[PDB]
Amino acid sequence: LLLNQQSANEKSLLEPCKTPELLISGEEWYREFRDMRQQYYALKLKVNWQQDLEMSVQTFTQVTEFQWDKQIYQFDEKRGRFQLCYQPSPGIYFVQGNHSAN
Amino acid sequence: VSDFSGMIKKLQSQSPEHALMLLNAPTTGKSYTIIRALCRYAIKHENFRAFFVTDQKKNLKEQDFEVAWREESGAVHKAFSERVAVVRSLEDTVNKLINDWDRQQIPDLYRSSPIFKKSLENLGNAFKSFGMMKENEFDLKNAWTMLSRAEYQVRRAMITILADKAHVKLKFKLDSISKGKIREFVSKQPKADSKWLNETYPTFDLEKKQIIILTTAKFIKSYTPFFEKRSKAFRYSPILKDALVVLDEFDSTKKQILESAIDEALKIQADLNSLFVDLSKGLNKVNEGQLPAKLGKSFTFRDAFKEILNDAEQLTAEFKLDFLYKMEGFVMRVKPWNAYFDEELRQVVLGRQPRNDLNFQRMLPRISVFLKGATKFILNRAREYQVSENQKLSSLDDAMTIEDACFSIYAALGLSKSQAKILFSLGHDFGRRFQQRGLSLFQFTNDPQHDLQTKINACFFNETPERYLLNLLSKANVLGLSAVLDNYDLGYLREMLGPRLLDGDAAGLRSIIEQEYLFDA
DNA sequence: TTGATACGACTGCCGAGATTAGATAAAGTG
DNA sequence: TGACGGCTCTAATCT
DNA sequence: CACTAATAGATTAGAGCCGTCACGTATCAA
């Protein structure tokens, strides 16, 4: 929980958050395709049951419209970390996955 | 039904010369008959392309055509839209695009992509601007250009979505290789998205479209291909090769053709003196080596190439077009001017004090007929270079629309764009006086921008609607579903076509045209 | 007079505003 | 079929 | 002219990837 309250920016504080997982991504980890599909990739941080920190890479792709059956992620640019989206919100939505070649 | 099918039957056999089909006359029921027979014909035979031409947008039977295809279709029916293509206008295409975008008519393949989303937003804004412009009662040219740019944006979006999807990239999009890959990819995996693509953009793969229902205005005012931005002309497209073009309301395909021809003639002007001398230098370029040879051979062969050149060189000395004319009202052709050659001035004068009048009035027709003959010769060479280039570059019916061929010939010969346009307009001509050589009006002018020379501006008209019908008769064969200067010249047609003809300043120019028509009659 | 072993491997800058005349250039109908 | 080896997406498993 | 309708996650388990196999330079031993 305390990790989930954190942020990537230097000299930050405890900001409330609703996303179960802490996914950290900035502007450097970002690329576009020929369809201009914004595709970030974050750094998932999680402490497992045996108190080991896991830093696995999570990749997110862009979807135009909301998907009520799939998980929808929105990039919080100010805090520099991805957030879960429970209701339709202004901005650009994201979903887990990386189907491009590289 | 069977009557119209039998009538259309003999056209393919008579397509050895692309015959006439007369004028089946009768009093909406007649139109509904042709669509059923045409549908059955196209369903029965795989290799046959029809060009049903109507006259009014409402008169187009888009609902009647679709309610006759499945009726004539067997169990192994085609995808309708994959064969039937209704050519639409930019305005209605934009309207349909917006309508499909709003209520999810378009498939999700082009919806999930964000570039399509932004292109449709831009298109909607541009269409709002177009509506405001239409409300303004203004010249629709600027707004049409803006709307065309907006639609080209989403068109290009479709290509950039399809290219990476298929096994290709490189984003002309390989107009000989990856175009085939795109068309093949959109023919095997899609089930419903292909239907929408074919229904919305029929020009994406036009060669495989069977029936082309379109209004006469769009039939004579070119069409915009999917991939390319510049609009190719219908009358020259390889698509029209060996086609059967039904002319519904054929009696009305006279005024439209004449009106378009008169605007085309008035719009494109050039100086006769400069245009002739420029052509002769380009013609002399051929004989004296030069040229890329690929084009050089054909020219050295077919002996008449040297006779046109020696004719040019002979009359150049006679009329001194090498020397620049000088001035100190229209001149129609079917108080007068003269021209000496004051050596002192080293030019020729044309002020009236008759000294050595070589009957300049006969100078004009000699140059006119020489230009006509040279342009026909260049047209034949352009056709040869066209067939050669298309044959070595085997491709999906898309190359050298023979406007490009003649324009390339003229650009290699060292001629300007306007001069090339005038020469091609004169050339595309392969009996009464009008239907033989037509009208040729000339008008002198002066300008402080060029005071040492006088531009002999020439307006040329040689494409009467009967000759347009004859050319459409060389490219394809017409039908006669139709039922003084608005009924063609059927006698002249029966004279020319012969064995195959039967069985079952705008205002000024207009006036002039009508006159000699009458005189000829 | 050369054969080892411990460490170098360097990216730029970072807006607003105001003034002109300039052939052109298509193809439409609810 | 340079191959080792971390590890990333993604199908699988598991309520 | 037209839409409404009304929609498993979370956590492992594995195939298959890229990418790293160090290189040109001062410098003490032998």
Automatic annotation (TrEMBL), chain B:
Keywords assigned by UniProt, alphabetized: Nucleotide-binding
Positions annotated to bind ADP 2: K30, S31, Y32
Binding site for ADP 1: T28, G29, K30, S31, Y32
Keyword Nucleotide-binding: yes
Protein name: Uncharacterized protein
